Amino acid sequence: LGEQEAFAMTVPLLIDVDSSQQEALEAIALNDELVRVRRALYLDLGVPFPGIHLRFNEGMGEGEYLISLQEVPVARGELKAGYLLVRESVSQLELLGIPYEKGEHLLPDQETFWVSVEYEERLEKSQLEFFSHSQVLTWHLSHVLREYAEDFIGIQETRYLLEQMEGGYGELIKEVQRIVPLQRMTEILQRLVGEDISIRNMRSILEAMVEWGQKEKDVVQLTEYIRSSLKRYICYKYANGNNILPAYLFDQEVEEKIRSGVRQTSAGSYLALDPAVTESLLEQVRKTIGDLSQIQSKPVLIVSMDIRRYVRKLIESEYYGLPVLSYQELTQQINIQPLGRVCL
Amino acid sequence: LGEQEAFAMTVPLLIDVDSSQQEALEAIALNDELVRVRRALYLDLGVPFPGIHLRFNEGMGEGEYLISLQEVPVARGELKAGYLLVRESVSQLELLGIPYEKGEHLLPDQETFWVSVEYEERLEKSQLEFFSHSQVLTWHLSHVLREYAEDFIGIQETRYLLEQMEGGYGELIKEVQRIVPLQRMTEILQRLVGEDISIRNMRSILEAMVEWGQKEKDVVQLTEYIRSSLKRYICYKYANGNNILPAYLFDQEVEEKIRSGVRQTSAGSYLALDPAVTESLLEQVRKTIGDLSQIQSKPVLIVSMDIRRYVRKLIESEYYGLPVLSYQELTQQINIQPLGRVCL
């Protein structure tokens, strides 16, 4: 036992589902239904995701499954599709109009109710959302990555991109590395994928990295200049229609209250107004935006560039699916259709 | 005798149990029951523990055993299971309701009373905690490491991690070594494992090492920023339930008395208020927290980040099993359920 300790590396991503399916589930693909949603999610965000280890554990129950990032279960579940109970995401009284018996739960994103596989034939005629045992699993996965993609872009992973691109763009990389150190360039790539912006376009992120890495030095400013280099991308991510975008402009009185609380002190530049002012603004927002749960068409808040960040991490608690843009990121020839200006 | 001195290295960890078992104990494993609890404890903390030498000494009695860190017995014991008296940890009047004769002691952590091996058959029916001759030994071991894990992470042991990780994360390490010297990076890894935080996740400790090792320079601040990188880990170590955490918030009046006594002088930043104020605060704590011996569910104190340390080493005498958190380490989506605010 005198062997010293034999260090063992932690696993980057891990899926632990129960036993009793290690050969029973195992048959849609569950080795080509993960690698499919990992690639299909890579081409969306661009993060070089890690290898998903798949372990069928017997220690848990029979419908349990936990998805552990680095040995801390981040989205566990007891799939009561355990035997076969293919769930329903947009479950409603329509599943009472389509009367097949239900099973209650609040599986995360939409109201989940479960029906059996004889009931499936008739409800698939009725056309609602069906999640097989693959699609119930990967969905949380494709939701775990999209929300924890700030943790897979580390100094070891960008140096993977800046090596994989050596062939294509030689003199671009040998120029960017001398201007922005790897720590600083990575502290940006995390800040893009935080707003669900896609790294994928890795060239025009380095063009705008070289251009501004000499003039600007505060990361939060530099990333607002770099988003402004993906102009005609964002116009396509948020406003899919004919150059019309449903916005929620901030009336100038507020964009000035926030620009006066930046506190550029210790490379944090924290927005520090007051625990009593934050609730004042966050109320004026909640008073106009409402809840946006019924509000369709995915609106976006639109605020000046230099505070586009601090507004984002402010309402990040209440309004999570409300992206924030800038005036600059808005490529011209976009018809902002203001839903309602946020007064004070 | 002219041989100069022939230097002989001290042993890192050493178990000295008596003779008369060197072949009699020797049969559960006692070479695979230590290496099992050493590995099982490594995957918990992450420290690369040393090799446990096992020596059966005759110089002692017949039920004695001492566990010596570097030749100073740190947890000795005369196991009065000497012949066979498998102990009981949660001994109570239930062992008078289950009337089998007892043997009194205060073996450390829970009330230890001993019963024989014919009594074992019936009390194992009654379902209380049994410690065989292995489990009485390793338990102190798995308690010695967990409490002296600040002594196994030295500059020689982190350079073992930063070499074992060269393969996986090359450019991460070649970046962190130039930012934080080995002394400074190790003075952190000791400060994590001091709070029972787990080094194990060695990547996101280096990501947050690179990020903050340039801005912050006081170790105690840097480690409070590094704990804030293991956010969604701590949420799982202290609040296992559904995002609900039983806290003991500090009312703001106190968190300001302590922030005024930091004395950042000689890289010690000692909290120096008064031997008469420390008893004032430590009384207001003891007046609300009580004793927490009956208080179940493992509550945690929750104080602002910048003094999370000085509060910890303050109550470290009285309330040892009361972990202290920050507001920052608390990942959002955690329902702090304040048990009672510590007023002044």
Side-chain angles (χ1 to χ4, degrees), chain A residues 168-183:
Chain A
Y169 309 97
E171 294 91 331
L172 179 57
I173 291 162
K174 305 151 205 158
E175 186 86 28
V176 70
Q177 286 175 349
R178 93 174 55 169
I179 292 175
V180 281
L182 279 178
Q183 183 280 302

Side-chain angles (χ1 to χ4, degrees), chain A residues 1-5 7-10 70-72 151 154-157 159 163 183 187 267 316-317, chain B residues 34 38-39 42 48-49 52 157 160-161 164 169-172 200-201 203 207 210-211 214 232:
Chain A
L1 75 164
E3 300 93 7
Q4 199 270 354
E5 189 37 43
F7 177 94
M9 191 86 222
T10 175
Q70 317 169 37
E71 296 204 25
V72 47
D151 304 339
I155 310 170
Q156 191 48 46
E157 312 276 0
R159 201 61 164 96
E163 280 180 9
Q183 183 280 302
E187 190 164 335
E316 197 187 52
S317 315
Chain B
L34 306 183
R38 201 185 71 200
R39 190 82 155 96
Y42 160 64
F49 290 128
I52 306 175
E157 313 276 0
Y160 169 56
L161 301 189
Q164 196 72 279
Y169 309 97
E171 294 91 331
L172 179 57
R200 189 77 206 289
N201 178 5
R203 162 201 180 86
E207 279 184 8
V210 177
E211 198 143 2
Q214 295 168 351
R232 75 277 185 197

Side-chain angles (χ1 to χ4, degrees), chain A residues 221 257-266 268-273 306-307 310 313:
Chain A
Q221 289 297 315
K257 179 186 305 178
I258 304 187
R259 209 181 294 112
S260 311
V262 282
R263 309 290 95 183
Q264 48 276 66
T265 77
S266 88
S269 289
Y270 45 84
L271 176 69
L273 306 155
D306 37 10
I307 69 168
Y310 311 140
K313 83 170 183 177

Side-chain angles (χ1 to χ4, degrees), chain A residues 48-104:
Chain A
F49 290 128
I52 306 175
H53 280 265
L54 189 44
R55 285 166 201 169
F56 305 100
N57 261 325
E58 57 274 346
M60 305 165 290
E62 199 271 329
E64 188 95 33
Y65 75 101
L66 54 92
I67 304 169
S68 52
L69 290 188
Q70 317 169 37
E71 296 204 25
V72 47
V74 74
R76 85 165 70 254
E78 171 173 73
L79 53 87
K80 78 183 65 65
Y83 60 102
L84 269 189
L85 201 56
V86 296
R87 65 180 284 266
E88 158 61 31
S89 180
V90 190
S91 47
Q92 202 264 338
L93 58 89
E94 280 178 351
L95 197 47
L96 284 199
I98 309 158
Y100 317 138
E101 52 88 16
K102 309 181 174 194
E104 65 175 346

Side-chain angles (χ1 to χ4, degrees), chain A residues 204-272:
Chain A
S204 57
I205 292 191
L206 296 190
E207 279 184 8
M209 192 75 73
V210 177
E211 198 143 2
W212 301 104
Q214 295 168 351
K215 313 154 193 172
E216 260 291 339
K217 289 89 185 163
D218 164 60
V219 172
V220 184
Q221 289 297 315
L222 181 44
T223 176
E224 300 317 316
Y225 284 162
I226 290 163
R227 287 169 55 97
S228 171
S229 162
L230 318 189
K231 262 186 187 186
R232 75 277 185 197
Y233 162 80
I234 288 172
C235 161
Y236 167 78
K237 191 166 88 78
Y238 291 132
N240 294 311
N242 194 329
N243 294 27
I244 190 152
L245 181 52
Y248 272 117
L249 303 158
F250 260 53
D251 278 335
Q252 166 71 8
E253 295 155 84
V254 169
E255 293 177 27
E256 183 60 28
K257 179 186 305 178
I258 304 187
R259 209 181 294 112
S260 311
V262 282
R263 309 290 95 183
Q264 48 276 66
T265 77
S266 88
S269 289
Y270 45 84
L271 176 69

